[PDB]
Structure formats: structure tokens, C-alpha cells
Design a binder for this molecule. Structure first.
Ligand SMILES: Nc1ncnc2c1ncn2[C@@H]1O[C@H](COP(=O)(O)OP(=O)(O)OP(=O)(O)O)[C@@H](O)[C@H]1O
Ligand SMILES: C/C1=C/C(=O)O[C@@H]2C[C@@H](CC[C@H](C)/C=C\C=C\CC1)O[C@@](O)([C@@H]1CSC(=O)N1)C2
Ligand SMILES: [Ca+2]
Ligand SMILES: [Ca+2]
Ligand SMILES: [Ca+2]
Lengths: 359, 125
């Protein structure tokens, strides 16, 4: 049985090829003494041990700990002998050449996998949506990308990266809330606000009219139960926190808005394919889960595009797992047997084989 | 790459119409008598090979998705379509065909009029 592993900035999504969902989803965190603990437990012992995120903005940045993430994945979460399963992993769009070789070397040298493959996260999400052509908006905990894809392959020259995503949004709810009079300013506190984020936040189709209703109506308000017990009334951040996605100034970021990068991404692509892109805008990643975000992108990019353009935002309910699900389908295909990088092939060519087998 | 799938070896060798159905993550040939009848619960891959005057062949690949096919099937069909195209040296034009919204070109492939029928194979997940 092949394994599928989607490593994110915040969460690890891991499981078996063939399954319809990841059997294992856990925090991408390694804790080391104040020799280490992994994910669901490291937040536990977080009193004794310093915790760090080995992946930043979708890129692997601490190899030593990343090696810990994988070990835990195979051994504590998946409960497999890694040396007997072909393993599929995922990577960000534009992962540096050396990262891809380092990930392949580790898998064959320190984990002894019999076979291995690396695919681009966003392309997997496109596949999971039953499509070969379109532009993916992928927005997780640590990064947001716009990835245009044509007849199966990403168009690297037109990809947009934006370091504003999920955590950045938590920190702003978790700063705007206190403006109301609440706490929130601890490495256990945002942890509560991110839960508020996930439950209460939504994207408004019109900001102003949403404003003109928020500071003037105890209807656009919800009450939430902290763990302490004290009840708090979420307002009006509900619609303000994700607004940062469209207006990045709110976090003082200056960057273009996700609708804008989407337009821009498409304009870097051959004119003959722009229609297909506009009509196949696929959303992927935890930070696209906000109620109302598909209706807003819609409106926002048809404003930007020529009237004649047929716009369409595709937002599958399972899009938290689209990347993983895309990998689960790919590694299950009868035709995938020969796509794998074998240990044989690795022994012959070493880690640079990845750039030839794995576009 | 370099698929060894028996169906791939047969794909696109002479002018005509070839139709496969996704079944449990595999590409399974459809009986020729049954061409044009599609299960709304399934996904299919269609290759139209046309004789070019220059002697080489023209390929159009269509992945057709029924209203009720499962995500593994539509996903597989899209992926199978990329692989077949690759296999054929990138010479194929790829087309996404959704039940009820198929291109005039695709519709024109079926002499007796294309037909939908309820049902299909179970999800390979
Ligand atoms: N319903 C929800 N509404 C909004 N945010 C959500 C929701 N569910 C999860 N999230 C957020 O999505 C993030 C998890 O998404 P995801 O797993 O796709 O990211 P990642 O892969 O870990 O990071 P990256 O892709 O940037 O490397 C967290 O920020 C989490 O708070
Ligand atoms: C259910 C859940 C989802 C998730 O996305 O977790 C990821 C991973 C998590 C790890 C760090 C925390 C303290 C320890 C354990 C967390 C467990 C479960 C968290 O740190 C995030 O929370 C950060 C911080 S605040 C935000 O926006 N991302 C994202
Ligand atoms: Ca991700
Ligand atoms: Ca079916
Ligand atoms: Ca082609």
C-alpha cells in the first residue's frame, strides 16, 4: 500500500493511498527540551520543551526537526514500516531544487522507502476537482499561492506566492478582539482564537454595507464559550479578520489582494488560455473555508475581468484535504506504477533523479 | 514516466474513436457496441483519432463526467487524460466534458445520438 503525506506549515495530513481521507491529521510541530516530541503531545509537554514549526511558508526550514515529523508520521501516526511502502509526498510550488533533493535523500537513506514521488500541492487539488486546467488558490496556515495550471502542469512563470495566510489571520482576530476588551496574547491563547476564527468568521460580499449593519445592529453578532467558561460575544471581527485576504493593509502588509493576485496570475499566462483559467478557479486549503469567500472572489474577479469573461469559483466542502485527496487518487492509479522513483533508480542517480522523474 | 498499461499501447494507433471507463482507479475498455451510452454515475475517457493529410494523426482527448460520478472517478479521468496526452507526445487536445454541457464537437462523435443511463460502477475509494 502506498502512503500519502501532505506536509503543511501548520498541519501534517497523512494516510493511505486509496482511502478517501487522511487517517492522520496533526500539528506540524516539534518540541525539544527547555530528544523531542511530535505534534499532538508537544503542545502538551510545552512546559518543559520549546516547540518549533519545521516548515515555514510551505517550505522546509528545519531539516533536523522535519526528520522528526516524518518519523512520527510513519511510526506513531500511520503505524507502518516505512521501508515497505512507496511514499508520496507533497511540496509547495517553486520549492528550491536542493529541498527536493534533500527530501528525496532522507526518504531513501534515513527511511529506506522502496519507492518515492513528490507532487506540487496545488496541482493535486486541481486533479481532485476533476480538472486538468485551471488556476488554484491554495491558502493554508503559512502560505497562499496562486497556481495556474494547463493541461496538467503548473505554469511556473505565472505562480504567485503570498506569505499572508491562516496564522496571520488568527493573530488579527486575536488583536482586534482585545480592542473590545478581551485578553488573547499567549501561545495557548491564539490557540483559542484560532478556534473562534474557524467557528465564527465569514467573508462579507460587501464590506461597507457589512460595516453599515455591524456598528448598528445586534444581529451580526455571535456568542462564544471560552474554555474558562466566561461567555464572549464575537463582533464584528467576524467579517473583518478574513477581510485581510482581500485588503492586506489590515495587517499592514501592503501586498495585493487574493483577488488581485488571481487576476495578475492569469495575465502572466498566454492569452489563448485565460478563459479556461477564469472558468476554473479552484479553492484549496484551510484558509479558504470561510463562509462567503467564493461569492466574494467571484464578484471581485469579475470586476477585474472583461465583462464577457465567464467566471467560476469552485469551492469543494472537502478542500481542507484536497491536496491529500488528490495524492490519494494519483498513487492509486493503475498507471502510476512506473511514475515512482525506485530505490534502484535512486542508487543509480542519487537525489538529482527527482528533477527528472518529478516535474 | 513510460506507462506500460495495455490500454495505452492500443491508444491512438489508427483513425477512429476509443472509449474507456474509469473502474476502480483503472482505465477499462468499453465494448464497442455500447459506445454512446454513458452511465451518469461514471466517468469516462474518450480519444478521437483523425487522419491528417500529412500522414500523422490528430488526437482529441475528452474526459466525460456524469452528474453522480464519485471524486475518485472524475479525478482519475482527469489524471488519465494528462498521462495519455503525455504518452502521445503532447499531441492531444484535452477536453473536460460535463454531463449536460458537452461540446458540440464531442456530441458530434456519436452517430445515433449520445445517451445517458442511470447507474454506474462503485467508487474505488
Ligand atoms: N473552517 C475554517 N475556517 C477558517 N480557517 C480554517 C478553518 N479550518 C481550518 N482553518 C485554518 O486553516 C489552516 C489549516 O489549513 P491547511 O492545513 O491547509 O494549512 P497548512 O497546509 O498547514 O499550511 P501551508 O499550506 O500554508 O503550508 C489553519 O490556519 C486553520 O486555522
Ligand atoms: C485543530 C488545530 C488546527 C491547526 O490549524 O493547527 C495548526 C497547528 C498548531 C500547532 C500549535 C499549537 C499551539 C499546538 C497544537 C495544536 C493543535 C490543533 C490545532 O498551530 C496552529 O494552530 C497555528 C497557531 S494559530 C494558527 O492560526 N495556526 C495551526
Ligand atoms: Ca498546505
Ligand atoms: Ca461510478
Ligand atoms: Ca496535449
Amino acid at each position: 500500500t502506498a502512503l500519502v503525506c501532505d506536509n503543511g506549515s501548520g498541519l501534517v495530513k497523512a494516510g493511505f493511498a486509496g482511502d478517501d481521507a487522511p487517517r492522520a491529521v496533526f500539528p506540524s510541530i516539534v518540541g525539544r527540551p527547555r530528544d523531542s516530541y511530535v505534534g499532538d503531545e508537544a503542545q502538551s509537554k510545552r512546559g518543559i520543551l520549546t516547540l518549533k514549526y519545521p516548515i515555514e511558508h510551505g517550505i522546509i526550514t528545519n531539516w533536523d526537526d522535519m526528520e522528526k515529523i516524518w518519523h512520527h508520521t510513519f511510526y506513531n501516526e500511520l503505524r507502518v514500516a516505512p521501508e515497505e511502502h512507496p511514499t508520496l509526498l507533497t511540496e509547495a510550488p517553486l520549492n528550491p531544487k536542493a529541498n527536493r533533493e534533500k527530501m528525496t535523500q532522507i526518504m531513501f537513506e534515513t527511511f529506506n522507502v522502496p519507492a518515492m514521488y513528490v507532487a506540487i500541492q496545488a496541482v493535486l487539488s486541481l486533479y481532485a476537482s476533476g480538472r486538468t486546467t485551471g488556476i488554484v488558490l491554495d491558502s493554508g496556515d503559512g502560505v497562499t499561492h496562486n497556481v495556474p495550471i494547463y493541461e496538467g502542469y503548473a505554469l511556473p512563470h505565472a505562480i504567485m506566492r503570498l506569505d499572508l495566510a491562516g496564522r496571520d489571520l488568527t493573530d488579527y482576530l486575536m488583536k482586534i478582539l482585545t480592542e473590545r476588551g478581551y485578553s488573547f496574547v499567549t501561545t495557548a491563547e491564539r490557540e483559542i482564537v484560532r478556534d473562534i476564527k474557524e467557528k465564527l468568521c465569514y467573508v462579507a460580499l460587501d464590506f461597507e454595507n457589512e460595516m453599515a449593519t455591524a456598528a448598528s445592529s445586534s444581529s451580526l453578532e455571535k456568542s462564544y464559550e471560552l474554555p474558562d467558561g466566561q461567555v464572549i460575544t464575537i463582533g464584528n471581527e467576524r467579517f473583518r479578520c478574513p477581510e485581510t485576504l482581500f485588503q492586506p493593509s489590515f495587517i499592514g502588509m501592503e501586498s495585493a489582494g487574493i483577488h488581485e493576485t488571481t487576476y495578475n496570475s492569469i495575465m502572466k499566462c498566454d492569452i489563448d488560455i485565460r478563459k479556461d483559467l477564469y472558468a476554473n478557479n479552484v479553492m484549496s486549503g484551510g484558509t479558504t473555508m470561510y463562509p462567503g469567500i467564493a461569492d466574494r472572489m467571484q464578484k471581485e474577479i469579475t470586476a477585474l475581468a472583461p465583462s464577457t469573461m465567464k467566471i467560476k469559483i469552485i469551492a469543494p466542502p472537502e478542500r481542507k484535504y484536497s491536496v491529500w485527496i488528490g495524492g490519494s487518487i494519483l498513487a492509486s492509479l493503475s498507471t502510476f506504477q512506473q511514475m515512482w522513483i525506485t530505490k534502484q533508480e535512486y542508487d543509480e542517480a542519487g537525489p538529482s533523479i527527482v528533477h527528472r522523474k518529478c516535474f | 514516466m513510460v506507462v506500460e498499461h495495455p490500454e495505452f499501447l492500443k491508444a491512438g494507433k489508427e483513425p477512429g474513436l476509443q472509449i474507456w471507463r474509469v473502474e476502480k482507479f483503472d482505465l477499462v475498455p468499453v465494448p464497442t457496441c455500447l459506445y454512446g451510452d454513458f452511465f451518469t454515475g461514471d466517468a469516462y475517457v474518450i480519444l478521437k483519432t483523425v487522419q491528417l493529410r500529412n500522414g500523422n494523426l490528430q488526437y482529441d482527448l475528452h474526459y466525460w463526467l456524469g452528474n453522480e460520478c464519485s471524486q475518485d472517478e472524475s479525478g482519475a479521468a482527469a489524471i488519465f487524460t494528462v498521462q495519455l496526452d503525455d504518452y502521445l507526445n503532447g499531441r492531444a487536445v484535452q477536453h473536460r466534458e460535463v454531463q449536460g454541457f458537452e461540446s458540440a464537437t464531442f456530441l458530434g462523435y456519436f452517430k445515433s445520438g449520445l445517451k445517458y443511463k442511470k447507474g454506474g460502477v462503485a467508487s474505488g475509494f
